[PDB]
Design a protein around this ligand. Structure first.
Ligand SMILES: CC(=O)N[C@@H]1[C@@H](O)[C@H](O)[C@@H](CO)O[C@H]1O
Ligand SMILES: CC(=O)N[C@@H]1[C@@H](O)[C@H](O)[C@@H](CO)O[C@H]1O
Ligand SMILES: NC(=[NH2+])NCCC[C@H](N)C(=O)O
Ligand SMILES: NC(=[NH2+])NCCC[C@H](N)C(=O)O
Lengths: 153, 4, 255, 255, 153, 4
């Protein structure tokens, strides 16, 4: 069932005339380039990008916003450890120490609640979480929306 | 072309 | 608004929720316009929150990923033949707004060609903010809705950057409640550190390369690595071999 | 020798290689005898090497694991109903000798009950050495054969320990060419260190537990942890939850 | 196809009268205890166990024996990192630096050749390697027997 | 009963 070729299909599809029609995209046909999943050009001509997002995090945490950080634990591009360390830098206090959260009877990943931020790992999921662990990804999303901690048991 |  | 409504996409199964897509000009002077895709929750779930979802790259499309192979309502069949419904689509619980950003990505476009050579986090965000303000004027029934911003990867930048503008904007119509970041850039230094450690702990580089990476990249940013950093990562790449770095235990696409 | 030959096991498919199993007394005085299972390579592969395979625990059976759910020729059907052939059985290329060890494990037994309360690496190995010498007298056609010793886990002890006796024994009949260890104990200190780091890098413990484990266990051995070490690992256990620690991304058995 | 309940089946099977007969095990029925996969007693009454096997390794390496160490990289009980560090302690020189080895067209794991020892990881395999990656486990075994390095390409 |  997992198919690693999704980007190919997508590309085929979005480049279809009828699909753009239906989407109301490229109304006049003036985008005279093939639709692609990413732009290598922009990818390659990027400018400003602060090194740390932490300060924003501090600001919004102080502003009382809800902040959740998650990570698919089999991704190696922006891996869990990178996240653990970055969040670790905020120095927040822990309200609920690293614990296993369950989906049904299975451990979906783990989570730790700090004062002002919730961290959640999604077990066995790569970079595209809702792609590799769709079921668990949804649970994650529902809890975040509710502002409730990932479920134990 | 590196995608995060 | 009604004009952006989608009737049916090619190959689309019949569903019980609506979708809209279209353009919003975010920079008249430059002729920059962003394309969006809105996938709503069924009635039984309304009025559900509004969630702005953003993919990273930078230069990757929210529609292509987010909507098409991730949390979006459908998945594209092979050969781009049609669609299947995503049984775990996040629009089962929220009104999901996918934004192709920045201009130049996906279906988003710019009238000033150089725009595509000058992108940066700042403009990206300002334009996104613009997009929103305007978007809400087009979908005024969404004003005041609980609103969240979420994304993955490079969107670890985009999300909190936008969030901060929104927050600071003091835009009364936007009821920003928070944001969520998945596998995202958070802090270059720490991220670099955790990255290499993780790789070494997953048996993907040599000890020497681990060490070379730590020494070459630590003062750099993910997006703009030094030449030492790149030389080091070229070796890591060679050590990694033909695996999918975005999912270590899954196969690479063969076509 | 011929007497140890197996004709057919219950539920066994028909195959093109022979197997033998039986007992060898390794300690007359104590009445210690080890049970073995020999699964030979088909003719087309002979004369193939002789490989002694050992499971760990300590207290786990080479037959139960090695032979029955790993590199062995067959796999047991559910409910212990019968057998299936292991398409990747290592006896496709070597004569595989599985040893239940020490006495008390599997089908191996001891006439002195206390034996089972006094096991240790030393005796384990000496008895294994004995087993071998004797085994070869029973299968004299294996003398001089290229011989290897291999195992996993606690056999990281058993294998090199036995290997050293054999080597030093200067037993002419045993042509020991080397050994291979899989996921094995090699050095308590380093192993402890890599273990915790690996766990933390797989998101299985908290930062604090990572730290508590490092501080509690580092001067201990895997087999005999201090009480600090155990307290710490009890927490890790709680953090790990209901997963299979021997295969992180696979499900636990539900029966 | 993967079935985590194998130990149960085994236990059922070996405790069968006919199977023991066929095996020539417990000839006289005097083992008056159920056959089990491990002995908790011995497990729990273990005595001597040196802390390091390294010295033996040094000895046998010096004696010229062939020595290979492997590791299923998704095992958390005696994980790859524990191994990397232990072998690292031998301080051997590297003849062939960490490289991806392939089975067919797929990366089976990685390997590094030192002077006197070969290290091999088996990608995606838990503790029981030939259980989780049977195909790759066999490749590993054939190369070791031949005394040849895991194949690149 | 810990198995390596
Ligand atoms: C460069 C900078 O400091 N911040 C902003 C601001 O100057 C500008 O108005 C905005 C609009 O595109 O993007 C950038
Ligand atoms: C205890 C020790 O130092 N080494 C050995 C040796 O004394 C003994 O002959 C052997 C036999 O079972 O097992 C142990
Ligand atoms: N599997 C990949 N090649 N993924 C590339 C896309 C990563 C991207 N930033 C995202 O938003 O997903
Ligand atoms: N999955 C398990 N419970 N494995 C226990 C067995 C580990 C054991 N030493 C072995 O030799 O495999």
């Amino acid at each position: 069932s997992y198919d690693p070729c999704t980007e190919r299909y997508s590309t085929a599809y979005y480049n279809r005339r009828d699909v753009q029609m239906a989407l109301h995209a490229n109304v006049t046909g003036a985008m005279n380039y093939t639709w692609a999943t990413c732009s290598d050009t922009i990818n390659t001509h990027w400018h400003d990008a602060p090194r740390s997002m932490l300060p924003i995090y501090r600001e919004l945490i102080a502003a009382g916003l809800r902040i959740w950080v998650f990570s698919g634990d089999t991704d190696a591009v922006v891996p869990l450890t990178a996240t653990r360390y970055s969040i670790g830098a905020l120095g927040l206090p822990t309200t609920t120490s690293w614990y296993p959260w369950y989906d049904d009877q299975e451990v979906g990943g783990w989570s730790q609640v700090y004062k002002g931020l919730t961290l959640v790992s999604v077990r066995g999921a790569g970079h595209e979480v809702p792609l590799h662990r769709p079921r668990q990804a949804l649970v994650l999303f529902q809890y975040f929306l509710q502002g409730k901690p990932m479920p134990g048991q | 072309f590196x995608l995060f | 608004h009604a004009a952006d409504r989608i009737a049916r996409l090619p190959g689309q199964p019949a569903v019980d929720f609506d979708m809209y897509s279209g353009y919003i000009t975010v920079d008249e002077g430059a002729g920059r316009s962003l394309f969006y895709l809105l996938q709503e929750a069924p009635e039984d779930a309304q009025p559900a929150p509004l969630v702005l979802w953003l993919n990273g790259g930078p230069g990757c499309s929210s529609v292509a990923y987010g909507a098409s192979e991730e949390l979006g309502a459908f998945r594209v069949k092979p050969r781009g033949a049609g669609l299947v419904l995503n049984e775990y689509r996040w629009n089962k619980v929220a009104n999901v707004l996918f934004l192709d950003s920045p201009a130049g990505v996906g279906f988003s476009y710019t009238n000033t060609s150089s725009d595509i050579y000058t992108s940066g986090d700042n403009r990206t965000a300002h334009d996104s903010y613009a997009f929103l303000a305007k978007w809400f004027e087009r979908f005024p029934h969404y004003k005041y809705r609980d609103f969240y911003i979420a994304g993955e990867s490079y969107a670890g930048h985009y999300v909190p950057e936008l969030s901060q503008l929104v927050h600071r904007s003091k835009n009364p119509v936007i009821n920003l409640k928070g944001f969520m970041v998945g596998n995202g850039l958070i802090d270059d230094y720490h991220d670099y550190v955790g990255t290499f450690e993780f790789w070494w702990n997953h048996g993907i580089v040599s000890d020497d390369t681990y060490r070379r990476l730590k020494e070459a990249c630590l003062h750099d940013s993910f997006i703009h690595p030094s030449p030492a950093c790149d030389a080091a990562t070229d070796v890591a790449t060679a050590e990694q071999g033909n695996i999918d770095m975005y999912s270590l235990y899954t196969p690479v696409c063969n076509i």
